[PDB]
């Protein structure tokens, strides 16, 4: 039932390296070490035998050559390149395509990863607390602005609001039904999602019927609200996401922060 998924793509946010056909986003040295090495090291620690890797239309054998040569791997990886992806579809269309391969509960983790955290304890929390989703938040730099806002419950630990300030209006707006239930709420500014996602089996029933997901963040975890109307047919446990806070440095790399990760390693 348990299996891990590695999500590979191509970067458009970065300035210089990625535009070349020979070099992909998966194979990039940051601190004299390859990027996908840390993903393989994590999966080896978490104890997973069934790992399947998804790939875009570009780089069909370059990822397969990187997994075989140099890299410790010692695991059977299933690399596939679907043709429905158009870049303008990113990952949700990839998720809707491959669904009969998954037998039970699945873990989604992108290729753009830097990790310095214990892996097994995140898996154990997913297994014990008995819910659909779990996400991780990590602090921004402290050594010598409008970004994004998360809401966290603290006693069971849950997630409610994750929407950014890009298309957000002049005023901060909250709904009453979503506040009256779960009355205590903590809003985070410094804490950021490092793309760690845990998922259950019962997600397979809804992905084939109703296409609603976007960017694997905006309308991925947001369908959870048992509020106001309640109209979408549920799979039978209340649809509820989770969150856990961490101190150590482990975050995403997509923008200008990639140069700061090199400064973090060399110390």
């Amino acid at each position: 039932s348990i299996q891990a998924f590695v999500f590979c793509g191509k970067g458009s946010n970065l300035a210089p390296m990625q535009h070349s056909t020979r070099l992909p986003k998966a194979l990039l040295p940051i601190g004299n070490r390859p990027m996908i090495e840390y993903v393989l090291d994590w999966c080896d620690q978490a104890d997973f035998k069934e790992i399947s890797v998804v790939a875009p239309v570009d780089e069909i054998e370059l990822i397969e050559s990187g997994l075989t040569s140099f890299l410790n791997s010692n695991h059977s990886h299933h690399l596939q390149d679907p043709k429905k992806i158009n870049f303008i579809s990113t990952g949700e269309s990839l998720q809707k395509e491959l669904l009969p391969r998954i037998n039970g509960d699945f873990v989604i983790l992108p290729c753009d990863f830097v990790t310095d955290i214990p892996p097994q304890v995140l898996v154990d929390q997913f297994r014990n607390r008995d819910d659909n989703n779990l996400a991780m938040t990590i602090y921004y730099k402290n050594s010598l602005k409008q970004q994004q806002f998360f809401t966290v419950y603290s006693e069971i630990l849950l997630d409610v609001y994750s929407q950014r300030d890009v298309t957000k209006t002049k005023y901060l707006q909250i709904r009453s039904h979503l506040l009256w239930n779960y009355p205590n709420l903590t809003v985070s500014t410094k804490l950021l999602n490092s793309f760690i996602y845990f998922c259950s089996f019962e997600l397979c029933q809804l992905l084939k019927l109703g296409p609603q997901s976007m960017s694997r963040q905006a309308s991925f975890k947001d369908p959870f609200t048992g509020n106001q109307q309640q109209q979408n047919p549920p799979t039978t446990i209340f649809i509820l996401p989770n969150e856990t806070l961490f101190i150590r440095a482990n975050n995403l790399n997509a923008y200008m922060d990639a140069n700061r990760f090199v400064l973090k390693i060399k110390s």
Binding site: K170, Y171, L172, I174, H177, L179, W180, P183, L185, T189
Partner: protein
């Protein structure tokens, strides 16, 4: 640090209690057979007040006479009471300007709206107020808050949502919501002027209002300057936050222990049930504060004063209190209910979750359930009552009378059904 003066906001939440406050004042009403003011005064004495101020206008003569009879007119008292007489019925802002014109406020003063019973030690509060005042110069007032009963699903009258700092504990927003009683509004709009100055935003609705304030000498000067502000919470706090004077701060204090302000009837009922229980550890009936009180604790939360008379083969319940000079007849069931001093009770009477104040006579064969009775009022024979049925002063209900849910009875001999005189609108009678 010593010398502290206090101002008490009375004549503030009148007619919020609908059938009462007709002849006698708001704060005269007993919680546990003892006036609401007495609780507040006990809180003042435990805090360490040297000078007391009171705001009386409506039924002011009865208040002044009660202070004359009080334990604080006597020379040994740590505080002396001086009453402020104002025009009949005015907002809190109008009284603030009146007091600033008179000019008695020195340094740090105290303001309490309504009557609050709490077991929370105030010495800690004063220290943390002073520590935060030494942090920066332009700092104003202090607010008290306590943790709610997990979910406030039964609490509808106080829907106050608070946005607070994790580091400095500064309030950001105040909002009222109709939500569960009236499903109409959902939206709450917040000002984005204080986003990166705070960073650690914490939004909570799970906090109970207290309306107890430690205030600086700035406050009465601001009230006279900005005379548009009528309220002290809804418009004032929000006005202070939203860049009226830049660099000015207001406190929000979190406390784990019990602190609930009285405002409504069903809130009053919960506080009273909390007092009968051992929620307020120091504030218990057996300790006796009014001096005339001679209450003694009995196991299973049963309170009895001295000179309690009871008939044989009678069953008493849980969380009950009975006053002094009280007589009870046979076949009586008293469960989760307060009965006042000098109250004569007939026979075959079943009481559950109800309320009876001082000097009340009840007729034989009557069932009373979750319903309140005021002082010097008599109940007849064959009386059946339901939940939330509040009966006014001196109301004589005659023999054979049935009243349904929420049937409020007037205390003055206006618009609502049932009055003070014999057979109250079951056959047209009443002035």
């Amino acid at each position: 640090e010593d010398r502290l003066q206090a101002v008490v906001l009375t004549d503030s939440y009148e007619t919020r209690f609908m059938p009462l406050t007709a002849v006698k004042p708001r704060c005269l009403l007993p919680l546990a057979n003892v006036p609401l003011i007495e609780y507040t005064l006990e809180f003042l004495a435990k805090a360490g007040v040297h000078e007391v101020f009171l705001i009386c206008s409506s039924h002011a003569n009865q208040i002044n006479d009660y202070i004359e009879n009080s334990k604080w007119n006597l020379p040994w008292s740590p505080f002396k009471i001086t009453t402020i007489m104002s025009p009949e019925a005015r907002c809190t802002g109008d009284v603030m300007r009146d007091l600033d014109n008179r000019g008695i406020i020195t340094g740090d003063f105290i303001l309490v709206s309504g009557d609050v019973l709490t077991n929370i030690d105030f010495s800690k509060m004063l220290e943390f107020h002073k520590k935060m005042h030494l942090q920066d110069k332009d700092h104003i007032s202090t607010m008290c808050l306590s943790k709610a009963s997990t979910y406030p699903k039964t609490r509808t009258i106080e829907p106050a949502a608070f946005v607070l700092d994790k580091s400095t504990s500064r309030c950001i927003y105040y909002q009222d919501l109709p939500l569960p009683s009236s499903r109409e509004k959902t939206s709450i709009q917040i000002d984005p002027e204080l986003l990166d100055n705070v960073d650690e935003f914490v939004i909570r609705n799970d906090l109970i209002d207290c309306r107890i304030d430690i205030c600086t000498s700035h406050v009465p000067l601001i009230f006279q300057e900005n005379f548009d502000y009528q309220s002290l919470r809804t418009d004032f706090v929000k006005g202070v936050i939203s860049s009226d004077i830049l660099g000015k701060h207001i406190y929000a204090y979190l406390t784990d222990e019990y602190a609930v302000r009285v405002e409504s009837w069903q809130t009053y009922d919960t506080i009273s049930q909390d007092f009968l229980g051992r929620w307020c550890y120091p504030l218990v009936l057996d300790s006796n504060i009014q001096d005339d009180q001679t209450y003694s604790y009995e196991s299973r939360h049963i309170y009895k004063e001295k000179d309690v008379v009871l008939a044989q083969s009678c069953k008493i319940g849980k969380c009950t209190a009975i006053g002094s000079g009280t007589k009870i007849g046979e076949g009586t069931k008293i469960e989760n209910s307060v009965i006042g001093r000098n109250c004569q009770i007939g026979e075959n009477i079943r009481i559950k979750n109800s309320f009876i104040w001082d000097d009340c006579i009840i007729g034989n064969n009557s069932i009373i359930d979750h319903s309140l009775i005021a002082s010097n009022a008599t109940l007849g024979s064959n009386v059946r009552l339901n939940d939330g049925c509040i009966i006014g002063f001196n109301v004589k209900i005659d023999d054979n009378m049935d009243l349904d849910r929420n049937t409020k009875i007037s205390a003055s001999p206006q618009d609502l059904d049932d009055q003070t005189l014999a057979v109250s609108i079951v056959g047209d009678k009443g002035v």
